Structures are given as C-alpha cells and as structure tokens.
A paper describes a structure:
Similar to other mononegaviruses such as Ebola and rabies, MuV uses a single-stranded negative-sense RNA as its genome, which is enwrapped by viral nucleoproteins into the helical nucleocapsid. The nucleocapsid acts as a scaffold for genome condensation and as a template for RNA replication and transcription. Here, we report two MuV nucleoprotein-RNA rings with 13 and 14 protomers, one stacked-ring filament and two nucleocapsids with distinct helical pitches, in dense and hyperdense states, at near-atomic resolutions using cryo-electron microscopy. Structural analysis of these in vitro assemblies indicates that the C-terminal tail of MuV nucleoprotein likely regulates the assembly of helical nucleocapsids, and the C-terminal arm may be relevant for the transition between the dense and hyperdense states of helical nucleocapsids.
The other MuV nucleocapsid with a smaller helical pitch at ~4.5 nm was reconstructed at a final resolution of 3.6 Å. This helical nucleocapsid is also left-handed and contains a twist angle of −26.8° and 13.4 protomers per turn. The rise of this helix is 3.4 Å, which is much smaller than that of NChelix-dense. We described this type of helix as a hyperdense MuV nucleocapsid (denoted as NChelix-hyper). The atomic model of one nucleoprotein from NChelix-dense was fitted into the EM density of NChelix-hyper in a rigid body, and only residues from 1 to 373 were clearly resolved. The C-arm is missing in the NChelix-hyper similar to Nring-13p, Nring-14p, and Nring-stacked. To double check whether NChelix-hyper was formed due to the absence of C-arm, we designed a truncation mutation on MuV nucleoprotein with both the C-arm and the N-tail removed and obtained the pure protein for structural analysis; the truncation mutation assembled into long and hyperdense nucleocapsids (denoted as NChelix-Δarm), which were then examined through a 3D reconstruction. NChelix-Δarm was reconstructed at a resolution at 2.9 Å with almost the same helical rise and twist as NChelix-hyper. Similar tilt transition will occur between NChelix-hyper and Nring-stacked; the tilting angle is ~6.5°. Compared with NChelix-dense, NChelix-hyper has 15% reduction in helical pitch and can reduce the whole length of helical nucleocapsid to 859 nm, which makes it feasible to pack the whole RNA genome in the tiny space of the virion.
Author numbering: 1 to 374
The structure:
RNA sequence: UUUUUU
C-alpha cells in the first residue's frame, strides 16, 4: 500500500528529529561543586609563567580534589587571554559550573604560596593547602617536575614573548590530549606522537617545553572527568571556528587541532555514510532496505538540526550521540564496513566488530568492493 | 557506548 509506505517514511523521520531538544534549554538545577579559578588582572610574564607551572602541578598532584583540578584547568586554558575574568565568563555558561574568580597578584618568592589581591578571597589555611598541593607530584614523574627537561621550570620569564612560547607549547600538548580523552584513553597512542611531530615541524610546539607522558596522561584524565572543562573547551573550539583567514597565534592552533577533535565517537556514522552513500555501486545492493536509508536520512537531518555543537557531541557527552550508534542501522553498517575494509587500509585497524554486525552483508560489501576493483 | 586515519 502506497499510503503505509509514505506514512512509515514520515513516522521514521519524525521519531528521529523529535530528539533535537531545545538549543537554549536549561536543565533542572542540581547540586554542583564550587570551583576556584585564579585570575591575573595584568599581563605579568613572571606571575603568568609561575601560575602555568602552579596549575600544571595542581592538575598532576595525587592529593588533589576534582574541584581543585577543574579550577587549575580553567586557569591553565585562560592564561593566553589578555583579560582573564571576561574569558572566564565563557566557562560560567556551563550548567554544571559554579566558578568563583580569585585575583592573584603574585607568588611568594622561592615558594608556590599565593599572594591574594585585597578584593580576592583567600584564607591562610587555603594558601597553605594550595602550596602543599603544588608540591605533591606522583612517583611516576621524574626530576620532581612535569617537564621532560629539569632546567625548564627554573628558567625565569621577564618578557611577554617568552611566556607565550612556553604557554602555547604546554597548551598545544593539552589540546592534543583532548583530541582523544573521551574516545581513546589509558592505552599507547600513535596519533598523539604524530600530532606533536606536526606541530614541532610547524614550529608551534617547542621540544624544550615538552611534558612527560605521565603528566600528559594525567592532564588527559583530568580533562575527561570534568564536564565543566569539556564544555568550556567546546566554547573555545567554536570561537576558533568563527575566525576568518586573519587570526591570532593561539586560535589558529586551536582551529588546527579542532580539525582533529571534530566528529569524535561518530566514526561508524561517517564511515557508513562514506562507504554506503559515497560509492555509486552501493544503491543496487542496499536499494531494498528503504527503512535504514530513511534512518540515515533522518540522522543527517538531526545532525544539521543540532547546529555547530553537533561536531563535539562526544566531548560534550550529550545523549543525542546514541541516535548515531550503528545498532540502529546494522545492515548498512555491515555493508559499509565490508566496503571500507577493501577501499581503506586504515579502516582495518578500527574496531568495527559488533554483536549486531551481519556477516552476510559484510561479505556482500567486501565482494562488491573487490569486484569493482578487479 | 567508544575504538582508524587526517
């Protein structure tokens, strides 16, 4: 019946785009932790550099609460901006965020103890607790410092041009660790080494300021655990995507790495589109499954409806990422994995093994791909 | 649920 087939297409599309949600919707308020973010009002290379090392040591300190790491990360990401407070208002948007700004004037010489501003709220108990935190590095860390080179932390910065080199190298490493914090973690990574080689070749990253892999893994762990930090990083990525050809040294880097962070955790969706709708010889095979084709059409509609934030569904860890899971289109997923194993050597390394992977349509895709080739 | 490469 033509009416039932037309009705079913409409029903399928409606059921999938009914999950778009509200762009400005605010969830019901739930308890949240208080986060203390440290702000430098003026551009002091000495103070800024010190705060960079302080926050790197807080992020890696074993005796540090989740709130302490979250504040240290927000401060570390905000070190480049000329106005720290106005850049921290971006972090405040997070619905799970309750950030308190603390203005720091300096550090006591020869110590990690903070010197709070008159307006800034810092007790003598907190200052001592933070100083003890900044000196609690893990055993896996060598030379008593996060960096690979011992002399780097001790180096004195008296110019803005120096702090910028140090800061941008550290933040390049932090962003590369973001690249696979929610998807790949607690395992050896080849891509991370490749990104570092690329950015050292570009001259963006300096090997004199590399961190130890243990510190990089600790930074990745701290970023993955907090939703405030990951939402703030999506805000920074969207700021980097709005730029034109003319841009700053920092947001050019952030856009370059956002190219690699984009569409993480949606590999099955984009590989299915690529190898099932990309090849002109797939319509003849999958023409029969109209229901799954309508599903993929409604998913391409849902992706556009989500907006720019759709590229960072995995970083944001939003529920709409369950719509793009291949268990809702298993036959076409199977066919596309078959086609892609022939056409892409790199795809073989990817784990396409699923409980629901149809072996018949996998082999249909393999034989179709090879047939066209030979 | 994710898991490749760019």
């Amino acid at each position: 019946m033509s009416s039932v087939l037309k009705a079913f297409e409409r029903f399928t599309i409606e059921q999938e785009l009914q999950d778009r949600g509200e762009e400005g919707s605010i969830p019901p308020e739930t308890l949240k932790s208080a986060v203390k973010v440290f702000v430098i009002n003026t551009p002091n290379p000495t103070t800024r550099y010190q705060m960079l090392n302080f926050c790197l040591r807080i992020i890696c300190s074993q005796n540090a609460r989740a709130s302490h790491r979250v504040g240290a990360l927000i401060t570390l990401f905000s070190l480049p901006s000329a106005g720290m407070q106005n850049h921290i208002r971006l972090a405040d948007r997070s619905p799970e965020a309750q950030i308190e700004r603390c203005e720091i004037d300096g550090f006591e010489p020869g110590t990690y103890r903070l010197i709070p501003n008159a307006r800034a709220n810092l007790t003598a108990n907190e200052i001592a607790a933070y100083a003890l935190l900044a000196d609690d590095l893990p055993p896996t860390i060598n030379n008593g410092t996060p960096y690979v080179h011992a002399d780097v932390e001790g180096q004195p910065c008296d110019e803005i041009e120096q702090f910028l080199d140090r800061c941008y190298s550290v933040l390049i490493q932090a962003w590369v660790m973001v690249c696979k914090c929610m998807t790949a973690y607690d395992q050896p990574a080849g891509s991370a080494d490749r990104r570092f080689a690329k950015y050292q070749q570009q001259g963006r990253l300096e090997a004199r300021y590399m961190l130890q892999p243990e510190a990089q893994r600790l930074i990745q762990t701290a970023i993955r655990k907090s939703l405030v930090v990951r939402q703030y990083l999506t805000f920074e990525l969207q700021l980097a995507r709005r730029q034109g050809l003319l841009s700053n040294r920092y947001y050019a880097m952030v856009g370059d790495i956002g190219k690699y962070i984009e569409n993480s955790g949606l590999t099955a969706f984009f590989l299915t589109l690529k190898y099932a709708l990309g090849t002109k010889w797939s319509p003849l095979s999958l023409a029969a499954f109209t229901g799954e084709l309508t599903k993929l059409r409604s998913l391409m509609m849902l992706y556009r409806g989500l907006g720019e934030q759709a590229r960072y569904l995995a970083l944001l860890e939003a529920p709409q990422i369950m719509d793009f899971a291949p268990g809702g289109y298993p036959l076409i997923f199977s066919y596309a994995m078959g086609v892609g194993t022939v056409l892409d050597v790199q795809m073989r390394n990817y784990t396409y093994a699923r409980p629901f992977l149809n072996g018949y349509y996998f082999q249909i895709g393999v034989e179709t791909a090879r047939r066209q080739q030979g």
